[PDB]
Design a protein around this nucleic acid. Structure first.
Length: 328
RNA sequence: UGUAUCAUA
């Protein structure tokens, strides 16, 4: 019921020892000191959220603070979200606010003031981690803005470094109607996303998720568009990782190994053999068929063995594939 | 022999 720091709360946020102090005097102290700290910081929220330590205190406050205090404190940050998102310290408190958000007003406020910055923030080191929180916390009805914002700039965000790490939380917390409209789009860029240094990490994710819900919708729509030309995407730094995934998911593993033999031929196996990225596709197609299908391992081996002769046997990828010929 | 991110005192 008594505070020695009253009238000097703001000066306790300029240094760290004070931020931990108030946080300490906020947990085991009740709401009495929640109205205290709030009232003497509200005029500095935006400033405190982006401080080296201020952010920590703001997050702490957001918890004990009552609804009305938040709704207020949100309407204060609302026109500063963008500069707070783009901030390494601000991105933290802004997320913590998106966490403690309860009422459906704090929601309509946050969504409205992020909506026209969605794309830009996702492409940001700290801006995306906030857009990731909206999916991780809000209702499907609420974070719909993200999906709407992201479904007009698919490749822009997917092929972008941090843009794809956000797409991964779309597929995680989205609606079966949403993800199955986001993927409708992604699928139309599966050519360029598989080759791209970041887009490929998303294609691997569409599959990853469906293989987690044991409900395969696009995993097949992917394979139907990535199989006809599988040797080409195999001898490629990034496409090779997408093909290893299809090769590592049972429900499709086989028919893909089966494309390396059908159209691939003893030729394609050579192309896989010598390439620095293909020799991993070939090397995986072995380990897998070996376990899943002894008629594939057998038809794979009776082509590989004839070609493991001479200079190859003395290469890094050569010695590795040699070890995978007869282990059944 | 070959890819991101997983991040504030």
């Amino acid at each position: 019921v008594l505070d020695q720091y009253i009238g000097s709360i703001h000066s306790l946020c300029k240094d760290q020892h004070g931020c931990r102090f108030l946080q300490k005097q906020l947990d085991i102290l009740g709401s009495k000191a929640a109205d205290a700290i709030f009232e003497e910081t509200k005029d500095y929220t935006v400033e405190l959220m982006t401080d080296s330590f201020g952010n920590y205190l703001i997050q702490k406050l957001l918890e004990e603070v009552t609804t009305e205090q938040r709704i207020v404190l949100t309407k204060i940050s609302s026109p500063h979200f963008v500069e707070i998102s783009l901030n390494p310290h601000g991105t933290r408190a802004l997320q913590k606010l998106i966490e403690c958000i309860k009422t459906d007003e704090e929601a309509q406020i946050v969504v409205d003031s992020l909506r026209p910055y969605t794309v830009q923030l996702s492409k940001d080191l700290n801006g995306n981690h906030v857009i990731q929180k909206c999916l991780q916390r809000l209702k499907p009805e609420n974070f719909q803005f993200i999906f709407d914002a992201i479904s007009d700039s698919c490749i822009d965000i997917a092929t972008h470094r941090h843009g794809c790490c956000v797409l991964q939380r779309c597929l995680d917390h989205g609606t079966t109607e949403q993800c199955d409209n986001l993927c409708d789009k992604l699928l139309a860029l599966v050519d360029k996303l598989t080759l791209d240094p970041f887009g490929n990490y998303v294609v691997q994710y569409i599959i990853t998720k469906e293989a987690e819900k044991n409900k395969y919708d696009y995993t097949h729509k992917i394979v139907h568009l990535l199989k006809p030309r599988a040797i080409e995407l195999s001898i490629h730094k990034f496409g090779s990782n997408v093909i290893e995934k299809i090769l590592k998911t049972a429900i499709v593993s086989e028919p893909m190994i089966l494309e390396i033999l059908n159209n691939g031929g003893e030729t394609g196996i050579q192309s896989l053999l010598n390439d620095s990225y293909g020799n991993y596709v070939l090397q995986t197609a072995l380990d897998i068929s070996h376990k899943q299908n002894d008629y594939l391992y057998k038809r794979l081996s009776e082509i590989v063995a004839p070609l493991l002769v001479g200079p190859i046997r003395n290469t890094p990828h050569g010695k590795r594939i040699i070890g995978m010929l007869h282990l059944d």
